[PDB]
């Protein structure tokens, strides 16, 4: 994670842009990140 943040910052000579994760999926009257979960033991 520390390395990922450091490279995400970018080089000194060039300033790299950013790439936001997720899209504005509104769930009501909001940036979100989806994940697919599988858990047999969760439900019984």
């Amino acid at each position: 994670a520390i390395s990922v943040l450091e490279m995400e910052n970018g080089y000194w000579w060039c300033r790299r842009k950013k790439h936001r994760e997720g899209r504005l999926l509104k769930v009501g009257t909001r940036w979100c990140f989806r994940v697919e979960e599988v858990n047999w033991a969760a439900w019984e």
Binding site: A1, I2, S3, V4, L5, M7, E8, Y11, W12, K18, H19, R20, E21, G22, L25, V27, G28, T29, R30, W31, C32, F33, R34, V35, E36, E37, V38, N39, W40, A42, W43
Partner: protein, 290 residues
Amino acid sequence: DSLGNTVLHALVMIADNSPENSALVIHMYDGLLQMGARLCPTVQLEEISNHQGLTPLKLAAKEGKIEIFRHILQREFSGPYQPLSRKFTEWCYGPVRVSLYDLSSVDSWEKNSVLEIIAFHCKSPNRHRMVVLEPLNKLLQEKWDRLVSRFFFNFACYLVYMFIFTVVAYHQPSFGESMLLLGHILILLGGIYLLLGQLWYFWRRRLFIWISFMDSYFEILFLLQALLTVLSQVLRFMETEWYLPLLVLSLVLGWLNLLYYTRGFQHTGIYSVMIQKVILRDLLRFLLVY
């Protein structure tokens, strides 16, 4: 509050990882949030700034409180209190439980995010326990799988630079002359580049973690190696007699620096922490002996 806190901040600070008071903390937090919604629904209680510019979530991340932090990170509710939630299940298919998490903890277009606070500004021993929660874990995996190419490209560039350094500095007299001159030019340029990059790194990361000693010694080693490299290279120009040994020190130090690019790239990472720990014992080691 005189310190800048509020009710939720105070609930965060007095919290602890013990389970006796965890039920108290989460129950009172949820109750206060619901009552605040009912009385004054026009105010964002979660988005209240401390005197250090922190929120209850950021404060919980910084102070090392994990149980309250996890609950705040995955808050669902039901009924009239739907908008006061951060985890929305779209549809359920037995075990298939596709869900959506909210991202107020993303570094991108958010200065002073939760990820930075966990990585840099956190001092707790639980900092490695807070990067396995589902939203942070999946976000980190998705972000790391994108930039492996840059990591390996930098690895290859460093490897070829070290090969050139070894070959050029090897055949020291103590059109071969042109080849050695060009090699020395390349080595001095690379040393200058490494010095400037490391200097920018330390200038940007001024506040450290505590003093930036137990976690960022590889950058110090890189700075030292390039510093001795440029020092010996510029001292050889004057034909001063100190250049010859120190130069190869740089060289040997470089072959230690190559261990950083490896040892942590894929299914190989659990080598480094022990090497970080072995330097701890030197506190009295040097003193008591000799």
